[PDB]
Design a protein around this ligand. Structure first.
Ligand SMILES: *C(=N)c1nnc(-c2ccccc2)o1
Length: 460
C-alpha cells in the first residue's frame, strides 16, 4: 500500500460562547454553509486529518472528543484516532486522523502560551499541536486573542508572544520559531480583529451583509489592513473571504447581529466582524491549496458561527537509501555562490550562518562573513564563495529536490539569531548555478534578506 504524496486537512475554528453545542454539527466538518464550500459529491470522503480549535469551550475534553468522533463516524463511517488534545482554560485543540495514519504520525508535541500581564493574563492565549506525518512536519495553532475593536495593537502583541514562546516541533531547530519549524503551519482561532467602521454605521453594515456585499466591509477588516502594513502575520496566507461576518449573532437564529453596547459587553459595541479565521504558511514550493473557506449557517448555540477551511497539502515519505540515514551520500552536495545577507540592524558585530535541514546529519556553522556598508545606510554581510559545501544524507533527486534549508544569521558576539529564513531545493536544474532568495525575520518581523546562488548535485 503506497505512501501518500498529498493529504487533505480540515481546520475548524469555533468560539462556542460557553454554551453546549447542538445535537448535529456535521455541516461544519462537511464545509457547508456560506463562502467557499465543499462539493456534495465529496461528503463521504474523509479528510486525512481533522484539526478542531475551540474558544470559550464549556465541555470536558472527554465530552468534546465523544461529540467529534460521533460526528465524523456519522459522516464517513470511519472511527478516527485521537492524535492529540490540549486545553488552556477554555481554549482547546483536537487533532484526529484516519486510523491508516496511526503509524505515519510521530513526534507529537503540544504546548500553550498565556498572553498579557496580570489584568490581561487569565483567559487569552493559544494552544498548539505539532507532529511529523512521514517526512513532513505539521504545526497547528489555535489562538484566542484580545477582544475589542480598539485593541488591534494588543492582538498583534499577542501574535508575537505566541510566535516567540510556543514550543513545538524539533527542539534542535534552536534559532527558529514556529514560523520556520514546519513544512505546513496552520494558525487559526478567534483572532478577534474587527471591521473598523464608525459605530453609527452599524445598520448600514448589516444591510451590506444582507446583500452579500462584503467588499466595503473587508477593506476595513483590521486583520487584512494590519497584514497589508506588515504589522502581523508576515508571510502567512489567507483564502479570500466570501462568507458573512461570523460575530456577533443573537443566539438560536442567524437572522440578527447583536452589536449594541450592553453591560455584558463592558459597554462596547461589537460591529459585525470576521473574528474567526484560518491562515497558513508553508515552505517555499510545497503544494498547499485551499479547497474550502466558509462558515456554517445551521449551528446557532453561540454568538459566533463555526468557520471551516480545508487544504490539499504535499507530503513526503520517510526516505531510506543504502547510505543515509546514518551516513552521508558522497554523490549529493549543496554549494552556495556569491551569497550575502542584507540586515536592518544598526549593530556592528561579526555574523555567521547556520544551515539546518532534515537532509543533513546535523546543522552546519559557516565562518564569519565580511561586513560592508550598503548604499542606503544598511549592513551587508558578504559570504562570497566562502560558505561550506553541505553533505546531504541522501543524494537521490526524488528526495533531495523536496527538501529545504533553514538559514539563521547569528552574531559572533552573542550567538543570538538576527534573522531566519528558508530556501527550497525544488530547483529548475541541478549542477547549474541558480538564484536563491529568502526574506529574514526575527520574532516574526522582517530583519533583512539573504540572496545568492545555489548549485545542487544529486545522484542524477
Ligand atoms: C515535541 N514536543 C517535540 N520535541 N522534539 C520533537 C521533534 C524531534 C524531531 C523531529 C521532529 C520533532 O518534537
Amino acid at each position: 500500500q503506497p505512501e501518500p504524496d498529498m493529504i487533505t486537512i480540515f481546520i475548524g475554528t469555533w468560539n462556542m460562547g460557553n454554551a453546549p453545542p447542538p445535537k448535529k454539527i456535521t455541516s461544519w466538518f462537511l464545509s457547508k454553509g456560506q463562502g467557499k464550500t465543499r462539493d456534495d459529491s465529496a461528503d463521504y470522503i474523509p479528510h486525512d486529518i481533522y484539526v478542531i480549535g475551540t474558544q470559550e469551550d464549556p465541555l470536558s475534553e472527554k465530552e468534546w472528543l465523544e461529540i467529534l468522533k460521533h460526528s465524523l463516524q456519522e459522516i464517513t463511517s470511519v472511527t478516527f484516532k485521537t492524535v492529540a488534545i490540549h486545553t488552556l482554560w477554555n481554549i482547546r485543540i483536537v487533532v484526529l486522523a484516519k486510523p491508516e495514519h496511526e503509524n505515519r504520525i510521530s513526534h507529537i508535541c503540544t504546548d500553550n502560551v498565556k498572553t498579557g500581564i496580570a489584568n490581561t493574563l487569565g483567559n487569552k492565549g493559544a494552544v498548539g499541536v505539532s507532529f511529523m506525518f512521514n517526512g513532513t512536519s505539521l504545526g497547528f495553532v489555535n489562538s484566542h486573542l484580545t477582544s475589542g475593536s480598539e485593541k488591534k495593537l494588543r492582538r498583534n502583541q499577542n501574535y508575537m508572544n505566541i510566535l516567540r514562546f510556543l514550543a513545538l516541533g524539533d527542539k534542535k531547530l534552536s534559532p527558529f520559531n514556529i514560523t520556520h519549524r514546519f513544512t505546513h503551519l496552520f494558525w487559526f482561532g478567534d483572532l478577534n480583529y474587527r471591521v473598523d467602521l464608525p459605530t453609527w454605521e452599524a445598520e448600514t453594515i448589516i444591510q451590506k451583509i444582507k446583500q452579500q456585499q462584503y467588499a466595503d466591509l473587508l477593506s476595513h477588516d483590521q486583520l487584512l489592513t494590519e497584514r497589508r502594513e506588515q504589522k502581523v502575520f508576515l508571510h502567512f496566507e489567507e483564502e479570500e473571504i466570501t462568507f458573512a461576518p461570523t460575530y456577533r449573532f443573537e443566539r438560536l437564529t442567524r437572522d440578527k447581529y447583536a452589536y449594541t453596547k450592553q453591560k455584558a459587553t463592558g459597554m462596547k459595541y461589537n460591529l459585525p466582524s470576521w473574528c474567526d479565521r484560518v491562515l497558513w504558511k508553508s515552505y517555499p514550493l510545497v503544494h498547499v491549496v485551499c479547497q474550502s473557506y466558509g462558515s456554517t449557517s445551521d449551528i446557532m448555540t453561540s454568538d459566533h458561527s463555526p468557520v471551516f477551511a480545508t487544504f490539499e497539502a504535499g507530503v513526503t515519505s520517510q526516505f531510506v537509501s543504502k547510505n543515509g540515514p546514518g551516513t552521508v551520500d558522497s554523490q549529493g552536495q549543496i554549494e552556495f555562490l556569491r551569497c550575502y545577507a542584507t540586515l536592518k540592524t544598526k549593530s556592528q558585530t561579526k555574523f555567521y550562518l547556520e544551515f539546518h535541514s532534515s537532509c543533513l546529519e546535523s546543522f552546519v556553522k559557516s565562518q564569519e562573513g565580511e561586513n560592508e556598508e550598503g548604499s542606503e545606510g544598511e549592513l551587508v554581510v558578504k559570504f562570497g564563495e566562502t560558505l561550506p559545501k553541505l553533505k546531504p544524507i541522501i543524494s537521490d533527486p526524488e528526495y533531495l529536490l523536496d527538501q529545504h534549508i533553514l538559514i539563521s544569521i547569528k552574531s559572533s558576539d552573542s550567538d543570538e539569531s538576527y534573522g531566519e529564513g528558508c530556501i527550497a531545493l525544488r530547483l529548475e536544474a541541478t549542477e547549474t548555478q541558480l538564484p536563491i532568495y529568502t526574506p529574514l525575520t526575527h520574532h516574526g518581523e522582517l530583519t533583512g534578506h539573504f540572496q545568492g546562488e545555489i548549485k545542487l548535485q544529486t545522484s542524477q
